[model samples]
Each structure stands twice: as structure tokens, then as C-alpha cells.
Target: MENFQKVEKIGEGTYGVVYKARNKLTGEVVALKKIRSTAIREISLLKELNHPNIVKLLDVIHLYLVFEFLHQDLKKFMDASALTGIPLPLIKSYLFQLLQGLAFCHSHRVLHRDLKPQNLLINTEGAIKLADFGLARAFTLWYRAPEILLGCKYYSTAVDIWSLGCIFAEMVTRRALFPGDSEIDQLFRIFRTLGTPDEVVWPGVTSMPDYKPSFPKWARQDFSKVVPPLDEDGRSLLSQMLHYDPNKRISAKAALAHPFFQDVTKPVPHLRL
Candidate 1:
């Protein structure tokens, strides 16, 4: 406790409170999450997992988990830029870092099953860091995968891909791609946007526990209309990540190599109004 002094309370939950603290001696800032339980799953995974874009665990004391403090989460950062917009180049940069983190996790057979703007941390240096792995085994409604929505429990890394797809669109349009009101309505929103899936499009769609023959069918809408700021390459990459069929969904490793990042270091092309 003498090594650091609490600067402010950043967050609080059933787990415990999170505080922005500073190292008394070095004057370095850090995050301290005081928990009621060990959070074994997250801690153990954090211990074994190390990637450039993954949140770093600096130290762990009895009930305190110390982490390298990041200034903002993607959600807050995006909200701040809501009036204008996140620069296209920075969006590409953050997405690339996200794919790099996921690629690393997927390669090791670890499913980040949950990915949302809130869990993506951002620093002043414009670096992205994946955080909050407690739900690594999931996403809330807005980012949940179609398979999961259809009651498919035996999912794989494709779930994360689905989430990143949602996040990707959000970055471009500055809004949730398929924000659903209810679970059923959630499915409806996705269907209305991307068209209802069938056995032809998704090999095993009709057989899913939640799918029904009487469900209303909708045709796919134009992606260009949804994310007008993004070019064809970005839209193409987004579609691959969001493929209804899990088997067809692009893997994180492959997503990184997609043409969307081909000009990652170059200036963004003129955006369409």
C-alpha cells in the first residue's frame, strides 16, 4: 500500500473497485483492482498470455491485481469523437492491433469469446490493448455472434470474429451495426441487415435450436450504405469476418493479412460523404 497512492476510482463492480493509482516513488500510474475473489481464470490466463496489444499485468498482491493503466477505453474514446469522427488511419491502426491480439489468442487455441469497444483499452500513444478477459468464454447482445444467437453452443474462435466484425462496422459508422432490443429482436436486426440465413447460405442454419421455419425472411442490404466511410476493401474484410457460417468466417490471422490493412501506413483515401 505504501508503494502506491490512490488517485481516483475508475470503476466498480461485484468483483471490486478499480482505482487509478500512482507509484509513490517512481510517480508511475497503474490500475489496481481489489477483488473479493482470486479471479483464477483471468489471472491464470493473463499470466500465460503475453502480446503487444494485450493489457499487461504488472503485479498481483493478495487481493490486488495491478495493471499498466491505460487512459481510455474504445467506447469512451469513440464517444469523445462522436461530434467529429475517429480518423480513418487511427481506426485502421486500432483494428490492426486488435487483429494482432486476437490472432495471437486464436493461434494458442484461446477464445476471447467476448470482444466489445468497452473492453478495448486505448492509450495516448494510440495503442490498443485487449482487456477484461473474465468473459473470454463471451459478448453482450450488440456484439454476440449469429451462431450463439441461434443457440449454437459448440462455437469456436468464429464467435470472436463475429464480434470484431460488429466492432469494425461501429468504428466506421460510429454506431452499433445490429443493435437489438430483445434476444429475438436481436436476431431480427441481424437478419434485416444481412438477410436471413438458410441451409444454403449457412450449411446448418435451419437445424439450430433457436431457428424456426416460420421466421420472417429478409434480404441482405448494401454494406456500402451501412459503412459509407469505408472502401470496398474494408467492407470486404468486414463481410468475411461476419460470414454467417462459422466455418466460412475469416480467422483472426487471415484477417490481419486482408487487403484492408494493405495501406495501413498510407494516408486514407478521400471518404465519401
Candidate 2:
């Protein structure tokens, strides 16, 4: 269109190509993603979302999505912190903003099945937004929840909580919480940390189509053992999000209330595109 001026290529993935663009007259910058018509559900769900922490679906030209420009994603931010390292205050702020975004999605019964750092956008002022909102069966192997790996189909919001826990741990250490090569290996990684579940923990897990009874038992790892920097509230919140049973996983609204975020007093920025 005449309004947008493509600035540069920013991203490309299984879904589409993203370009950094600017409004010719308003001087506003935005990210333009050329997605396929196959992604109708993703676009519809994104358009339904209206939250400060969620990426704005400003306009659509066929499959092209317009979103307010963001400086970088959380993945890059984490990598940069790998050198100079991120400040404690900064990490907390970033995570808080992410939860705010997730909370809004979960409240609406939407499932963001793909929640890796690469899909989390961050602005200059600690403003974080959820990106690459899932519509298809999209998922990054390591970032995916165990329930999905188990072939469970009933979970929607629970999966987001599991990803949130993984993202939280990743932000703290700047490395993946579970790096699995395959689906089975992925479940094993989670079991190794949270310990394999039984009938009592998950009730009807055995009835699930993909239930496996022969997996080795792995004692639950102490949060401090791996994430040494996490405090009491942080560890507690982590447990609720990472619960093996999908039903037991904490809800997004509850996650926002966790004491870990009590100190995050930054007001959400105004919604813009």
C-alpha cells in the first residue's frame, strides 16, 4: 500500500516473512508479515485480542499483518544478556510483561501453543508483547508442554502455562530449560525434572492415547539446584506453571498475582500501532 514503506527484512519462519516498515506520512514504524491464506485462524484470533502486552493486529492487506514496530525479541535480548548479562530488575520487568500478555490470552480461552523466546517481542522501555500467536498445531519441540507431547487434546490454556514456566527459567539462565531432540526425549526431559506422573497426579492420564507406563522415574529437581538465582516466590510460581498435570497448571490471571511480580510497578504502555 502507499502508506507503508518497507525498511528491511526482519524475520522469516514456517508461517511467513516479516519486514520492518514505516508509515510514509505519520513516521510510525511497524512490522509487516506476509502470511499465507492458510493462517486464517491465527489472523482471526490475533484480531480478537485487544491488550497492551499482546502484539496489535493493526491492519490486514490480504495476508500481510501490520504491527507496531518492536526493537527486538526476547531471544535476542537473552543472548545479549549472555555477555554483559541482564539486570535483576530488567529480567523481572520483562517476565512480568510476558505474563501480562499470557494472562490476557488465557482469559479469552486462546492457546498460544508456540511460546518460545523468538516469538516474544520487546520494546525499548521494557515493553514485552506476545508474537507469532498460534492457530495451527504450531509448537517448538523444546518449548512445547508435556500434555501435547502425550497426545492430549483437551488442553488449551494449560499448555501456555507450561511454556510460561519454561520461558521464565530460560530468561533466568539464558538457556533452554529442556532441550530435547525428539518428542519422547522432550517428555523425558520434563519427567527428569518434575518426575514422571502416575494415576494420582494426573488422574486419568493412563487413559490418554499416548500414555507410556515404562518411562523411568526421575526425582524432581530442586528449583534452586538449577535456577540458583530464583527467589522463594519465583520458585513457587514456577511450580504452579510447570505442573505435570495439565489441569493443575496455574491460570494466567493467578500467575499475574504471584508475589514474584509484586515489585513490578511499571504501568503497561498505551496500545499503539
Candidate 3:
């Protein structure tokens, strides 16, 4: 902390204040976040997480954390893509990075419960990095798993997979696939597109802690018609990701190995974990 010099204020929120800082000794730039008031889940989980596509926490001085500074989040990057469409190769590259980071986390038995475009950081090199675990325990309903919505006591890594699927869809379309005013409305939109789940598809739905089975039976939307912009392989991978059955949902590791990312998939070395 002695050699750290404040460059500029970058962000502020309920969690705390963030600043762009420089290290006088190393002549390096970094992001410094002051944990003024928030839970320590982010720190605990980030301390255990180490990956290329995940934000790097370089140093921690008391409540302040120094991380590798990023240019912008996926939300802002996607906005820039509105004028000139993002190329297929770039999308594949970004998607593969995201899946690889997620696969690493899941294998380590940690879940990034909240995953959205806002939490996905992007750099000038076009690499996608996952960020912001502050809202992790309480995720946005649009990206939440159905089991969580049905009042399930437990959830698996599949929860993050579902959120990934939603983000993937948005990346392809450049607009939110399921934009709803309320949580139930969000789930209803999901069910309406994928068709309502029942005892046959979602075995977990049969028995919930509080919520009763009252979801309207909705017919599945044609995958080809919905995300027509996606290539055949991309569409196929997305379908597997958004499966109604949690058991049927694709894993992060498998998603990376999917045919959609065949051209862009990089060699992943086994983590020492």
C-alpha cells in the first residue's frame, strides 16, 4: 500500500469505491477497490479463484483489494458492437473464454451464482472476463435457475450454466432474450420459449419447499426461429445449455468442448487443484 498512488476514481456503489491506481515501484497500473460496506463473500471466493478470464486480485491491503484494471464490461462492449456487428470469430473467442473460466470455477467447487453482461468484463484485446460477485448470492431472476425459482433448498453449478445461456443468447441477439418486469414474469418468458416444465422434464419441480405447481403449460418455441442469427452449431449448443431439466443441462467443460467452439477452443491445461 505504501507504493500505491491513486490515479483516478473509477466506480462507486453499495459495495464500495473503486479507483484506478499506479504502483510506483513496479510502474504498473491496477484497480483498487475499497470494501467500505459489503459482505466478504467476493473476497473469500476470489482468494481461491485463479484464472485468465477471471479478474486478477493482485494485492489486498486491509479492506482494499488491488486488481488488474479492465477497459469496460460486456454491456458497454456490446453497445459498441451495435453499429458494426461483432464477427463470428470474436464471439466464439469471447464465449470460449467465458466457458473456460466457468469450467475452472465449477471444478474447484465454487459457483459464480450471478452472471450477467454487466458482470462480464472486456478489454481492448476483446477478451471476456467475469467480474462482480457482490450480487452473486442474489442473482437477477432472468439468469436464475428454475429450481431456485421453485423454492429449492439446493442448487448446483447448473445455475451458472443457465445464466451463461441467457448471456450467450443476448450476445447473439444484442438484446435481452427474456426482459421481464418481475421475477415470475421472467420465468414465465423462459417457460413460454422453452415450454413449461413439469414432472416429466423437471423432476425437481414435483416437490418444492414453498411454491406450488401453477406454471401455465406453454409450447416450446422453435429454436431455429428464435435465434435465427446463430449458426447451426451455436443454436445446438444453446439448446443444450437452456435445458429445462437441471440434470440435462450442459456442463461448462462440455460447453467448451461443444462443436460451436471447435475453431476457437484453446488448449486448456489441467489445473493443479
> Which prediction has the highest lDDT against the true structure?
1
User: Can you give the lDDT of residue 134 in candidate 1?
Assistant: 38
lDDT of 1 by residue, 2-109 (tens): 799999999864457889999998999998888763455556666567888888777667567778888788888777777787888888888898889998878877
**Per-residue lDDT value at 4 in model 2:** 89
Note the Cα lDDT for every prediction shown. 0.82, 0.78, 0.77
Candidate 2 residue 126 Cα shift, in angstroms, is 1.6
**For model 3, how many clashes?**
0
Candidate closest to the true structure, highest TM-score: 2
lDDT of 3 by residue, 166-210 (tens): 888887887778887787888788888888877777776767664
Better of 2 and 3 by TM-score: 2
lDDT of 2 by residue, 72-111 (tens): 8877777777766566677677778777788777777677
The lDDT, on a scale of 0 to 1, for candidate 1 is 0.82
lDDT for position 123 in model 1? 68
Residue 38 of model 1 has an lDDT of: 42
Misplaced by over 4 Å in model 1 are 1-4, 12-16, 23-27, 35-42, 59-64, 266-273
Ten residues in sequence with the least summed lDDT for candidate 3: 264-273
For residue 228, model 3's alpha carbon misses the true position, in angstroms, by: 1.5
Query: How many collisions per candidate?
Result: 1, 0, 0
